[PDB]
Amino acid sequence: EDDEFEDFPIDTWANNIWEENWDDVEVDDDFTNELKAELDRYKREN
Amino acid sequence: SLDDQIFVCEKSIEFAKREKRVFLKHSLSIKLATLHYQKKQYKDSLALINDLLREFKKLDDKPSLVDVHLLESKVYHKLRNLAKSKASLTAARTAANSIYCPTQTVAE
Amino acid sequence: VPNYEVSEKAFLLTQSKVSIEQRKEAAEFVLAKIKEEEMAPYYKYLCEEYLVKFDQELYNELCKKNESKIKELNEKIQKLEEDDEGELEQAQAWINLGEYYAQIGDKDNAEKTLGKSLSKAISTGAKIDVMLTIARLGFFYNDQLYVKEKLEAVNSMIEKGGDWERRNRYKTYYGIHCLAVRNFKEAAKLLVDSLATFTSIELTSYESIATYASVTGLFTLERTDLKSKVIDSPELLSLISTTAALQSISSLTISLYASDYASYFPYLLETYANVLIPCKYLNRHADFFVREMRRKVYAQLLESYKTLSLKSMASAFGVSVAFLDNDLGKFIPNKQLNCVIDRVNGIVETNRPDNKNAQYHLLVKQGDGLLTKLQKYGAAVRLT
Numbered sequence: 135e136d137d138e139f140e141d142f143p144i145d146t147w148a149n150n151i152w153e154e155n156w157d158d159v160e161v162d163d164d165f166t167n168e169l170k171a172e173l174d175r176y177k178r179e180n
Numbered sequence: 181s182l183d184d185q186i187f188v189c190e191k192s193i194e195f196a197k198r199e200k201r202v203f204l205k206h207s208l209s210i211k212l213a214t215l216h217y218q219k220k221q222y223k224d225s226l227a228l229i230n231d232l233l234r235e236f237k238k239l240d241d242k243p244s245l246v247d248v249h250l251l252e253s254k255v256y257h258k259l260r261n262l263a264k265s266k267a268s269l270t271a272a273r274t275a276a277n278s279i280y281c282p283t284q285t286v287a288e
Numbered sequence: 289v290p291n292y293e294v295s296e297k298a299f300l301l302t303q304s305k306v307s308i309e310q311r312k313e314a315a316e317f318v319l320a321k322i323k324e325e326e327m328a329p330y331y332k333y334l335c336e337e338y339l340v341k342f343d344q345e346l347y348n349e350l351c352k353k354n355e356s357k358i359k360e361l362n363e364k365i366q367k368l369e370e371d372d373e374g375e376l377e378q379a380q381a382w383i384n385l386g387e388y389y390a391q392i393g394d395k396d397n398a399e400k401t402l403g404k405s406l407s408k409a410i411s412t413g414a415k416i417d418v419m420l421t422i423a424r425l426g427f428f429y430n431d432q433l434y435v436k437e438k439l440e441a442v443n444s445m446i447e448k449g450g451d452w453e454r455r456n457r458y459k460t461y462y463g464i465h466c467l468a469v470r471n472f473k474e475a476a477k478l479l480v481d482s483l484a485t486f487t488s489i490e491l492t493s494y495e496s497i498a499t500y501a502s503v504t505g506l507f508t509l510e511r512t513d514l515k516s517k518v519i520d521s522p523e524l525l526s527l528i529s530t531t532a533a534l535q536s537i538s539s540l541t542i543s544l545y546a547s548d549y550a551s552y553f554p555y556l557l558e559t560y561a562n563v564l565i566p567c568k569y570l571n572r573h574a575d576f577f578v579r580e581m582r583r584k585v586y587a588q589l590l591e592s593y594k595t596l597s598l599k600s601m602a603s604a605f606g607v608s609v610a611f612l613d614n615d616l617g618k619f620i621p622n623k624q625l626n627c628v629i630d631r632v633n634g635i636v637e638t639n640r641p642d643n644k645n646a647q648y649h650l651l652v653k654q655g656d657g658l659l660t661k662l663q664k665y666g667a668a669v670r671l672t
Contacts, residue, residue, distance in 0.1 A: 166557070173607060
């Protein structure tokens with residue numbers, strides 16, 4: 135019960151142990167940096 | 181109070197070891213240690229007293245033992261631990277029965 | 289052992305945004321313990337990792353003296369296998385051999401040496417504790433699988449028998465491992481009870497593991513069990529200012545438990561910089577932590593309100609509205625947060641499952657979600 139599948143070639147190319155939620159790989163990295171500017175930006179005005 | 185009173189009794193350790201006396205290096209170590217709670221600098225008498233913890237019971241200097249557990253117990257009691265500070269006063273109590281000291285000490 | 293500190297400082301040098309001063313003095317601390325540790329599998333390994341300076345003369349010398357001593361211990365052994373009563377002892381000289389590979393920090397070599405070293409008749413502390421060291425190399429190089437297998441080994445060695453005084457250092461290993469992956473939920477109990485007793489010479493300082501048990505604690509602990517098991521610390525109290533973190537992170541946790549909202553974010557940023565990113569175990573997980581630690585506060589802030597106005601919140605935390613709205617928008621649609629927003633009026637109302645009503649609707653939805661599934665697969669197995 136073996137056939138070559140020569141018709142479907144395996145793709146040719148031109149060249150984290152924990153399971154992830156997507157938002158794991160959201161990983162937008164923003165908040166740490168955006169925050170500080172938000173905090174101080176605020177309290178300079180008040 | 182001033183750092184000068186610290187310095188002169190450190191030179192008192194200098195004297196006690198110019199005579200080579202462990203009795204007054206340890207007693208003058210009480211003196212210093214107190215000088216080093218004067219500022220709540222007891223982080224310094226943290227080290228000085230934690231060196232002085234065996235210095236009296238190698239001498240078995242009993243009033244000096246309850247001097248420690250008094251002072252040290254207030255040091256770590258001031259360090260936000262009442263478990264070991266409490267244990268240390270309770271180490272002075274048995275001592276206090278095994279020593280005799282001016283009533284002021286009993287008051288503390 | 290290896291002394292770990294070299295590794296932490298190494299990692300410190302790796303990271304970009306650490307303070308450059310700690311990067312320096314960390315670095316020369318490292319190098320200083322290359323010299324006295326006559327140690328070279330780093331020098332190329334580390335220099336490679338810096339690349340991700342190099343002086344091969346020094347390297348050569350270190351290698352040479354290493355050859356000298358490995359030679360010597362091997363030879364001593366060669367005297368000892370002839371020696372018959374040294375059964376327990378030849379294994380011990382081996383322990384100094386592969387151990388010397390630990391000072392020489394060569395993984396495969398101490399590996400093989402201690403593995404074969406299990407053969408000789410030995411104490412549980414050897415067949416077990418030696419394994420613990422073998423994995424401790426794992427902790428050292430940051431290969432978590434190489435650890436995993438071995439904590440399985442030791443797991444067996446314990447499951448048959450051995451002292452609980454070994455089981456404790458065990459649980460410290462397997463715990464800080466659990467932290468080395470996203471899994472805090474285990475590290476909660478593991479670490480937080482590792483405070484009762486701790487073996488430092490194994491890996492790390494007591495204040496490090498303090499920062500770990502306090503971080504995991506903050507992260508997965510409930511409000512009443514936070515107060516119970518952490519805010520009330522026969523231990524952490526005995527430390528406090530002891531390091532450059534526990535005062536920061538505790539200054540965070542108290543700002544949580546006690547509802548100080550104005551201060552929460554500043555201490556949050558602090559700990560992000562001071563404790564998290566330097567930790568070789570935590571830095572990988574840094575973001576996954578902070579994201580979470582935002583939610584909790586938002587959660588905790590609403591829980592007493594069925595409605596409250598943005599500018600109240602923004603005012604509290606001390607950020608502008610638009611950014612606050614922008615933040616909540618991350619959590620809400622994921623149903624990780626039971627709020628919902630009304631921007632027209634700048635208001636926030638909380639829909640959470642308490643009143644029997646809510647626990648009705650939510651149940652209807654979940655029920656139908658189970659049905660449609662069940663039917664779906666149903667027809668498939670029907671027709672098959």
